[PDB]
Amino acid sequence: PQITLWQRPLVTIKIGGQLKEALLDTGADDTVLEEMSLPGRWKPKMIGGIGGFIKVRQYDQILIEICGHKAIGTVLVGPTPVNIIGRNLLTQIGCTLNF
Amino acid sequence: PQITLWQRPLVTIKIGGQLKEALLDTGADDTVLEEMSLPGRWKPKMIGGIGGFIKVRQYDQILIEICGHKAIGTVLVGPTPVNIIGRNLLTQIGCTLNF
Numbered sequence: 793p794q795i796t797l798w799q800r801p802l803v804t805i806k807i808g809g810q811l812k813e814a815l816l817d818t819g820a821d822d823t824v825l826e827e828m829s830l831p832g833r834w835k836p837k838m839i840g841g842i843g844g845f846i847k848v849r850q851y852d853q854i855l856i857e858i859c860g861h862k863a864i865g866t867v868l869v870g871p872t873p874v875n876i877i878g879r880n881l882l883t884q885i886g887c888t889l890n891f
Numbered sequence: 892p893q894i895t896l897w898q899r900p901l902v903t904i905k906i907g908g909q910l911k912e913a914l915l916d917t918g919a920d921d922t923v924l925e926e927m928s929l930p931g932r933w934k935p936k937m938i939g940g941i942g943g944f945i946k947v948r949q950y951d952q953i954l955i956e957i958c959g960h961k962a963i964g965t966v967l968v969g970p971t972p973v974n975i976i977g978r979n980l981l982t983q984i985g986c987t988l989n990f
């Protein structure tokens with residue numbers, strides 16, 4: 793798809809058997825998801841944003857289906873206010889900025 | 892241009908007579924610039940992100956030249972760690988997401 797930006801660029805994702813909505817976020821290096829039940833190992837990590845830092849759980853090699861595209865990579869889980877698909881996954885679905 | 896997302900989507904902007912680099916950020920509703928000397932009158936505001944909130948100064952009808960394209964709109968100035976071009980200006984330069 794081509795997505796204009798008059799509204800937030802939200803897409804439906806499937807991850808860990810659950811359906812969610814997430815923001816396609818070119819400003820995010822990494823993918824950060826709201827508190828959710830994810831299976832497997834995880835490493836504690838801290839990540840920084842506009843208002844400070846949050847502690848997240850890092851999961852690697854996690855499969856996400858984003859608007860019918862499959863990607864695998866690192867997902868961070870924690871107290872983000874919105875689900876963010878970051879550049880680590882955007883590159884896998886071939887996403888580009890155009891103007 | 893078309894911009895792939897293997898690196899951060901940075902562009903050069905000119906605002907208030909100064910040259911800066913800023914991130915093309917589809918996850919940002921509004922445009923947020925690091926502390927800088929802007930001439931106008933401003934309104935106090937708070938904005939929220941991943942780690943909490945920051946106080947910013949809101950300036951309206953600010954001219955920004957983003958990668959040569961000209962845009963006018965609201966700019967927020969405050970303790971953001973990265974200069975962020977948000978959707979309020981991205982729409983003016985015709986920016987779209989494509990995959």
Ligand SMILES: COc1ccc(S(=O)(=O)N(CC(C)C)C[C@@H](O)[C@H](Cc2cc(F)cc(F)c2)NC(=O)O[C@H]2CCO[C@H]3OCC[C@H]32)cc1
Nearest residue numbers: 819820821822841842916918919920921938939940941973
């Ligand atoms: C009123 O209108 C607004 C304008 C901006 C923001 S907002 O807090 O800024 N936000 C919106 C929110 C969905 C996260 C945009 C997002 O694009 C930031 C933009 C950014 C980049 C940055 F490098 C440093 C920042 F402080 C902020 N991304 C980031 O928080 O990323 C985190 C985690 C992912 O991985 C990493 O990637 C980069 C940093 C880290 C809010 C309101």
